[PDB]
């Protein structure tokens, strides 16, 4: 069991203005952190949020939170569940931002919700420091969904902050699970994105602002513009036809034009990744899976996931033999990899 910490710095908070938090467990024989951000979407106006707190209220909010929660997956303490990383320091920061980790706004006169996601980040890490973090060999940033593109949004502003607190021996690393999307016709939400970012004061990194300048920062919140802009090290788990992705481009399982659609998906989501040497994307119907307990099931090429992942660690000590780190399926069709989850 993770147990909660509500952050002594209470003016960082939920977006109703109750502290945020995160949960720990610590283990003192590893140099080890992974720091996961959970998932769960976003709202982008004052109607859109009032609906969000009647009925998904602890994404807004830690007044109900529970006092532990059992880590899973990739933070199970477990070697048979998590091959990869079972000795590690584990951490997970809960969403109440509502933002995708991007903003940086408290709640006021004028505000009646607080979006601070990207302050949340930085206030964890900072109060880690003095549990542990500070004798770190390497900061594993993960998340899922909304919180896997809040990782490609904050790695690099976290490597930042802990060099400027004088820690430069600390490796910041990014693994972005799920929330590598494409701006794409629908068969039948770039301005929700566009609106929500004016609302929540959102941030975006420095490099990809200034590429896509005022006015277009939501661009970098799609993966292939922003990842090229990124100098931390970050892997890239992402299922070709990810059901979010299916879902906003109102796709529901075939005639010959969904056909045409769905395989044309598939070759747009493997041509993103030509260029992303440390990847897992395999052509499966899903979404989400580091923290599932059966992440381990899943094989590209006969490679699994937690393999993937340990060769990564080896190729940050040119490619290693039997030890890939780009495992990207060619075959065109949902579930035309034996290993997809059922
Ligand atoms: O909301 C979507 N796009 C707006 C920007 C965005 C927001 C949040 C996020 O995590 C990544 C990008 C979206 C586009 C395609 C498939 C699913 N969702």
Redesign the pocket.
Known sequence: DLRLHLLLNTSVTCNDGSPAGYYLKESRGSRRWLLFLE?GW?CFNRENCDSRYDTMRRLMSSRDWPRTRTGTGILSSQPEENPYWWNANMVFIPYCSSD?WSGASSKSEKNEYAFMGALIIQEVVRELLGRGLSGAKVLLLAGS??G??GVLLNVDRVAEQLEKLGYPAIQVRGLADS?W???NKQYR??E??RRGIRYWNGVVPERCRRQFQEGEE?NC??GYKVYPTLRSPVFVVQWLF?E??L???NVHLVQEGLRLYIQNLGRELRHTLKDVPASFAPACLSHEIIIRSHWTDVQVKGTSLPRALHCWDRSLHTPLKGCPVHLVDSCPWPHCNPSCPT
Request: proline residues 4%; glycine residues 12%.
């Open positions: 998932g976003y995708v969904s909304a896997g593109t929330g999307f494409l701006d939400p770039t929700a994105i939501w919140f799609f990810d979010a992705q879902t906003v481009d």
